[PDB]
């Protein structure tokens, strides 16, 4: 996250850190005690599918404070329509090997109904994006969880205001074009969370775009509303052997 602030410990309790061989991979969002939403592209280059870990209740990566909860990733579910190394349909649903325990420091973000998200949430201007990504373009990653308030653009507006992957119906733009504030590498998969009447909801996933905090460009986010039904169906399904599962979309 570029141009944000430290998320006070416990104020982003749905934030997930994904590790591969102990190394930072990506972010994610807890939506239930066993389910995490991330970005498909985070998994393009995974060798050993068995060495993926999700950490809940993380804050300062330099220390252990006892609020952290680590789980093995048992399933990584990606839409059939996602093509590695691209941008469209950049979403993954992860099943944890064992549930996390909800605590003051570990709480799911609400996965909204499609109608609600489309009719209402999509029109809330500002939303929060968070992660332990780069603090600057070509810069070091953050040790403490960072958060940033970004405004959402209608795609028409995004396109107009921008100056190379298309912006599809499965995406949305948010942020700033002045190169001051953005999500960045290391933040992918993390939440774009939207407040409505006292509750927070999952509306986007940090995807990937024009470097980070690049003048004349906005951050691109996966439009979660397009995937609600797909997610819900999968959460009702039995696990399958082998970590990676490609699931038909729609």
């Amino acid at each position: 996250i570029v141009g944000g602030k430290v998320c006070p410990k416990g104020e982003c309790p749905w934030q997930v850190l994904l590790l591969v061989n102990g190394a930072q991979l990506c972010g994610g969002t807890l939506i239930n005690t066993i389910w995490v939403v991330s970005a498909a592209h985070c998994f393009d280059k995974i060798k050993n599918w068995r060495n993926l870990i999700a950490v809940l209740g993380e804050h300062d990566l330099s220390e252990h404070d006892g609020d952290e909860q680590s789980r093995r990733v048992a399933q990584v579910i990606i839409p059939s329509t996602y093509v590695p190394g691209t941008t469209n349909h950049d979403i993954a649903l992860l099943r944890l090997h064992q549930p996390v325990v909800l605590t003051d420091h570990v709480v799911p973000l609400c996965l909204p109904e499609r109608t609600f998200s489309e009719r209402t949430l999509a029109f809330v201007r500002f939303s929060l994006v968070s992660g332990w990504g780069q603090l600057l373009d070509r810069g070091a990653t953050a040790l403490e969880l960072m958060v940033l308030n970004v405004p959402r653009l209608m795609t028409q507006d995004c396109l107009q205001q921008s100056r190379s992957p298309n912006i599809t119906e499965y995406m949305f733009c948010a942020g700033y074009s002045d190169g001051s504030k953005d999500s960045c590498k290391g933040d992918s998969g993390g939440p774009h969370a939207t407040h409505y009447r006292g509750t927070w909801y999952l509306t986007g996933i940090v995807s990937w775009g024009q470097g980070c905090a690049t003048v004349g460009h906005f951050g691109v986010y996966t439009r979660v509303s397009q995937y609600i039904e797909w997610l819900q169906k999968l959460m009702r399904s039995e696990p399958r052997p082998g970590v990676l599962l490609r699931a038909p979309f729609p």
Partner: protein, 58 residues
């Protein structure tokens, strides 16, 4: 009332019904109040609420 407008007055989720009818609903871990619009937690850690903040205002 209609759901497309002002969320049908619902705090959370809204469904249109046949006629001049609407029903509000709540996410798991919430229940709908008698006002027919408001949602109150039914569990300790409902989704989308920040405990340290909820306490901070409790």
């Amino acid at each position: 009332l209609i759901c497309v407008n002002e969320n049908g007055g619902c705090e959370q989720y809204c469904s249109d019904h046949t006629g001049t009818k609407r029903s509000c609903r709540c996410h798991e871990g919430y229940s709908l109040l008698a006002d027919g619009v408001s949602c109150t937690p039914t569990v300790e850690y409902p989704c989308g609420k920040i405990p340290i903040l909820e306490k901070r205002n409790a």
